[PDB]
């Protein structure tokens, strides 16, 4: 994803 | 916090 968020389940 | 992670509950 093109997103600045860093979390990944 | 000095962290690159972006999540906040």
């Amino acid at each position, epitope marked *: *994803a093109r997103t600045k968020q*860093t*979390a*990944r389940k | 916090a000095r962290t*690159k992670q972006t999540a906040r509950k």
Partner: antibody
Amino acid sequence: EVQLVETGGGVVQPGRSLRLSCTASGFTFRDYWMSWVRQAPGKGLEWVADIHQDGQVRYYLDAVKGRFTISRDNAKSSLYLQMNSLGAEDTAVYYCARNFVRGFGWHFDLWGRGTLVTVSS
Amino acid sequence: LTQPPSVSVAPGQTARITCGGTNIGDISVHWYQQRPGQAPLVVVYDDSDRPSGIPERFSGSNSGNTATLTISRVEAGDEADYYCQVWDDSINAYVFGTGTKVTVLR
């Protein structure tokens, strides 16, 4: 002109120590997180360590935590990796790499040509 | 992160290199090209952007559990190892895929 250059590689005895230097040119070194990434002969890339612009916040691969120390000298535009208690698993090409996030994700946007450390008696 | 050890493709045709990892689609993926004895070089970053210098034949996508590097109109110069990479915020580590050798059929 913009470049990273690793030195300090070569043979080193198991259990002994070696210190790698990375000399940065062509850019403002103190503005960047800097990293070490390694690659054992014929193997894949393996991240080793990050160091924050101001030299105190540091992250390590588990397998080297306790034995390796990453440090920097911004006045000298230089990155260091102090390697102790070396073993055969540490034998690899060690790359100096610049950290950058442009749009979205942190990656390595500048690499040195790397230097090979061989752990051997 | 999981990558096929190798992909081979005929010149002019299309190479697809996958990068597997749970929910990898939820974050940004970047791709390095490494020629033998050379330093890694970014060819695709932030899922699908190209650094200047990099031919438009290199594209990327990323969704679900699989990011994909696509090389169109393959030529001999594209022979190399390719590595995907993410950053893992749960352990503060950079993570690389195991790498894929592209071979060009002739």
